[PDB]
Amino acid sequence: QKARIKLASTNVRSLEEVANQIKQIAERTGVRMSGPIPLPTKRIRIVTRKSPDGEGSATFDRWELRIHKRLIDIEADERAMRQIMRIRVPEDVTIEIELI
Amino acid sequence: CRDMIVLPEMVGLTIYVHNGKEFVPVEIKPEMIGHYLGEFAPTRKRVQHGAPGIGATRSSM
Amino acid sequence: MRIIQTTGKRKTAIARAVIREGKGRVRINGKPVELVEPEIARFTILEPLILAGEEIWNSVDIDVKVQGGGFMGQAEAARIAIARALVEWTGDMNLKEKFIKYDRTMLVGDPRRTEPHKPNRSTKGPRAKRQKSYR
Amino acid sequence: ATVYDVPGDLLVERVAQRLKEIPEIKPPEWAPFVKTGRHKERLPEQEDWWYYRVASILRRVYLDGPVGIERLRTYYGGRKNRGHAPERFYKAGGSIIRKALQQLEAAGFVEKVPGKGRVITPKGRSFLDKIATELKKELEEIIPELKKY
Amino acid sequence: DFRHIVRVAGVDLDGNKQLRWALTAIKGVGINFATMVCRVAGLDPFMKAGYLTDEQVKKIEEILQDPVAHGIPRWAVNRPKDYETGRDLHLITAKLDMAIREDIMRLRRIRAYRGIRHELGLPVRGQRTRSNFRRGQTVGV
Amino acid sequence: DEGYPAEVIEIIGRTGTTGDVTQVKVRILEGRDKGRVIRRNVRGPVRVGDILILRETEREAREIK
Amino acid sequence: AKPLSERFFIPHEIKVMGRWSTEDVEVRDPSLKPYINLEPRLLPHTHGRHAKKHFGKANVHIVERLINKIMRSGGSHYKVAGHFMRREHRSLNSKKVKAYEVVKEAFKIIEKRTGKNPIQVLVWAIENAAPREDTTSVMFGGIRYHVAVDISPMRRLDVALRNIALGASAKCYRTKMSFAEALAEEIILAANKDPKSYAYSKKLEIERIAESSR
RNA sequence: AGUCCCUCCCGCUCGGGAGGGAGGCACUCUGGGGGGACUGCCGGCGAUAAGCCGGAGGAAGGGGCGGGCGACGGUAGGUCAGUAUGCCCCGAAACCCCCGGGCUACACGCGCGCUACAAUGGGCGGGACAAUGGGUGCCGACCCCGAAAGGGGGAGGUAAUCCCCUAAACCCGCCCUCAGUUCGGAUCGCGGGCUGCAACUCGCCCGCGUGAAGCUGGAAUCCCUAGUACCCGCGCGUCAUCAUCGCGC
Ligand SMILES: [Mg+2]
Ligand SMILES: [Mg+2]
Ligand SMILES: [Mg+2]
Ligand SMILES: [Mg+2]
Ligand SMILES: [Mg+2]
Ligand SMILES: [Mg+2]
Ligand SMILES: [Mg+2]
Ligand SMILES: [Mg+2]
Ligand SMILES: [Mg+2]
Ligand SMILES: [Mg+2]
């Protein structure tokens, strides 16, 4: 009777906007929602040699990509379920919903 | 086929194994059972060193 | 039924201590503090209690849970937590004054951490480098 | 008194001495000729190392059960000298630990939890705790501070 | 009783050493194999070698004659699966030396790669030879 | 045979080939010339109030700028 | 071997290693008096928080100074008694526990052999091993000459400790004597002005060279 | 952690421990927002300016500490064998495939390292404490077989959930006692395995045996200012198999 929502994006602000929209949807209805839980960030780190050839001193680049995550639990209410089913997320945010 | 294993039924024959540029003759003896053919066809020539040339020592450069 | 909790940190070691009224029993991860080895580690934990005195020592029971770091790092974190718990429990500033004179770090902690490594012989350290040759 | 109240090595010594009275604990037939792991170099020197190993395994199961063969193998590994190459860590073998656990189960000291490993039975818990209590009674004669615990 | 010199299997053993370490003077016997034979014979490996009796020496030599028949595992002997008879054997001193020489001679007769490497006095098990393995004198330019 | 103690009262400046020596003014505390103020050369870190043990008290270092 | 009363030792008073009190130890030399710290303290391990500030080593207990001094290899890039001593991977670098044990056993031996407080003997030794005059080098015409100068007290203390440690290290290198015994022997010899002490002989040589070049 | 319930141990239980279930967000942690340090306060030097030196309080004091970002130009410095591209050449071979060799040779000179030359140790038994990262062509707990390397089944995991994952240096007890040795483990013999279409040239692992030089290093010369240097192991990259390497912990 509860739904679990997982959010992930490479931009923090869009994630915050989507979470706030879900929070307000839950607020405008009588329904209990466990707050957005922040899960640990994913860091993808790649270290590469800079020069194309092998002459000279060795210097390195450290490229990094960060992926943020959030977790939200809400109880399945059809009046509130339709609203979150129709909210539109930006193209740089991934959302997945499941019933437990 | 340099990686063929010598078998007992091969004893008594003569086989020419490629060594990179030519086929060398091998006469199979009974004590060769269990070895690869390539073990009897060397691929490199023995080394007989000449006089060290310019750049072989610190003072020769 | 007073219960007081305190925390201590030392280079990736974390210690959480609970102090209450008791008979004088102190345990580190369940082991009596008198059986802690080696000796240099045991003396690190016992200093705040010895400074406090025998009367205070025999009137309280302390239980400490510590994780992370090494055997010397865990001893110091437990020492910090025990000192903070002692000063907060009895709440007298004469004891607090005595601790600062003997060792300031007992109450303020140690903020040192490892420095990240850099290229040119990265595995050895941030500043160690490969031997240089010219010919 | 419990296991947590005494030093580990002294308790292992006492338990090893006591375990020789149990008819179900017997070294296997290949015991005289083997090393205790690929990282070792020479055979064990004590003529009764089997009982020491069994006692150590029993105390290990008491504290960290349920636990299986692989984790115990990790526990009994160590550093190996590799000639001209740098030293490295390696695990231990499997036959010794498996045989010891089977003998302990036959003696009624441990039991098997499916999919999880082996845990200590009440009989074995009493067996260890009684020896620990005796050792602590002896120990506090020379360390008066242990009477509080 | 105590003897400062004891001869076993044609080798004179120190009497002040422990038996396990004393027996290692025999070529073909290491520390592990010595401990095995000591345990099989029913002798404390830590006893002095100088307290041995004649019957014990006879027993030890008999064990060294055919260890497998006396309960030593087949994976512990120094020549398992013999090339001629096919049995599991343990060899010591002159017989060991002549067996090794015979193996190398067999490799040499069939003109195998390892035989040539043995003949030329060069590394046999695939080492690099450009940098190390240098034994000689500097050549000038 | 035991030297004479002196007390540093003023620091003048660094000197020496590699800046390893400091020039100081000291006051003799004991002996024939007790109370006199003379300048000396010292090797090692030093501050006002330290006490030196002079083996003799008749040599005076040349003034530096 | 070691009695259980010693393996599990519980102190109850603030004293050095819980075994020796420094209440009656006196320093005769007026120059070294303010630089030999003798405040009461149980565990001599300050975790190296003093090296940051200038003159910070003044307020560090002398026993910890000795422990840090012997926590080394000994002969890395100059010869001691005619030999390099490169311990390498079997040295006492960063192993402060082993150095602690070595110093403790050395103190036990010292107290047993002489019947006095070990800290007092150590103080006497460092007093006897500290030089009072040194020299600096000048270059003229491609030749190196010496000029005599004076030594500040802190450098005196540092040199004394280093020489004691070096002598102890040299006495136990590839011999049958152990490190603790060598340290005790070196301290005892230096306390009695015996010429067989490495530190005392080094001090005599330094002072002679400085004197002969005023 | 405090509170409740059930079960099991001990000195027989006044007391003291361990699991499990309810229950909670206290503490740790995770991640968004915010505060905090400014030569702001005090005393000197300097000019009364710019600043400098020394103290108080403070988690932190004077670019707070560690990184990223390298101006106009030069070096005919390296790279057309990463990719793009002018000219010149081959254009039925200098283009495209397949099999076998080589880059791994070896009187010798040199760079960077690993292991040692032993007691500031070697061996055997026992006792302690991590972090960074990675996993579906994969990580694999748990059970069984084998002395070891390994073999046969196989839960859970698309992961703060399951796994790699109970590190070593360190501590306790016994043997060895200054010796080319119970130091060192190069070199070689016999046997057992794994990856792979293929292991001889030319792979890695295990058992027994064998036991080289080396007893501290000339003239010269390198790195490093604090959680730094020294000592100790681990993760990832490369990768079917293979780490004395690079980058990190
Ligand atoms: Mg580091
Ligand atoms: Mg272990
Ligand atoms: Mg080693
Ligand atoms: Mg150019
Ligand atoms: Mg050019
Ligand atoms: Mg090449
Ligand atoms: Mg080339
Ligand atoms: Mg050895
Ligand atoms: Mg091959
Ligand atoms: Mg030697």
Side-chain angles (χ1 to χ4, degrees), chain D residues 1 11 23 28-29 32 35 49 54 56 58 68 79 82 100 114 133 141:
Chain D
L11 181 58
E29 198 149 5
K35 297 184 298 179
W49 59 276
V54 170
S56 187
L58 180 60
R79 188 182 63 161
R82 304 196 300 158
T133 297
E141 295 300 329

Side-chain angles (χ1 to χ4, degrees), chain F:
Chain F
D1 58 338
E2 309 180 11
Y4 318 97
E7 177 184 357
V8 179
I9 62 184
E10 184 176 354
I11 310 298
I12 293 184
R14 314 297 293 252
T15 176
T17 294
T18 60
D20 200 11
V21 182
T22 318
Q23 181 155 122
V24 301
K25 278 187 177 304
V26 304
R27 157 181 301 150
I28 314 295
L29 299 182
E30 174 193 17
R32 161 186 181 175
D33 61 356
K34 168 179 181 177
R36 300 185 59 255
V37 178
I38 60 175
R39 62 179 57 205
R40 279 273 187 156
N41 289 349
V42 181
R43 185 187 180 189
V46 61
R47 55 186 176 185
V48 173
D50 297 326
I51 298 180
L52 312 176
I53 303 297
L54 309 182
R55 305 189 68 188
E56 90 295 334
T57 65
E58 58 174 344
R59 294 174 56 252
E60 301 184 23
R62 179 218 303 265
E63 171 178 353
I64 65 178
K65 298 160 300 305

Side-chain angles (χ1 to χ4, degrees), chain C residues 3 5 7 9-12 14 16 18 20 25 27 37-38 65 67-71 74 104 108 111-135:
Chain C
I3 302 290
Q5 298 172 319
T7 311
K9 293 182 179 178
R10 182 80 166 94
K11 51 156 66 169
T12 67
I14 301 177
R16 293 171 291 191
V18 170
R20 76 182 67 181
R25 302 189 295 263
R27 293 181 179 267
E37 305 183 34
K65 303 298 186 57
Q67 67 183 20
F71 73 97
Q74 288 192 349
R104 182 169 175 264
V108 300
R112 287 183 292 177
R113 299 293 193 274
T114 60
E115 171 178 340
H117 292 194
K118 317 294 190 310
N120 195 336
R121 213 80 188 195
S122 175
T123 175
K124 282 176 60 190
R127 307 187 185 192
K129 295 187 182 63
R130 190 191 194 192
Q131 174 176 340
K132 189 166 184 181
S133 59
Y134 297 88
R135 300 176 185 91

Side-chain angles (χ1 to χ4, degrees), chain A residues 37-49:
Chain A
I37 305 106
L39 293 183
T41 309
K42 297 293 195 65
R43 295 151 157 265
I44 303 178
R45 196 172 299 103
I46 294 181
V47 184
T48 63
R49 176 84 173 261

Side-chain angles (χ1 to χ4, degrees), chain A residues 54-72:
Chain A
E55 174 271 351
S57 292
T59 51
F60 295 86
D61 271 328
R62 286 175 286 275
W63 301 94
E64 188 168 350
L65 184 75
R66 299 179 179 175
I67 296 172
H68 308 257
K69 299 170 66 178
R70 294 294 188 276
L71 183 68
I72 292 182

Side-chain angles (χ1 to χ4, degrees), chain G residues 149-174:
Chain G
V149 297
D150 192 8
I151 312 183
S152 66
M154 199 164 66
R155 178 169 172 82
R156 298 182 60 196
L157 182 60
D158 296 358
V159 175
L161 288 172
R162 179 169 68 249
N163 287 342
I164 289 179
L166 285 180
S169 175
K171 288 188 183 305
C172 71
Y173 178 61
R174 299 194 294 189

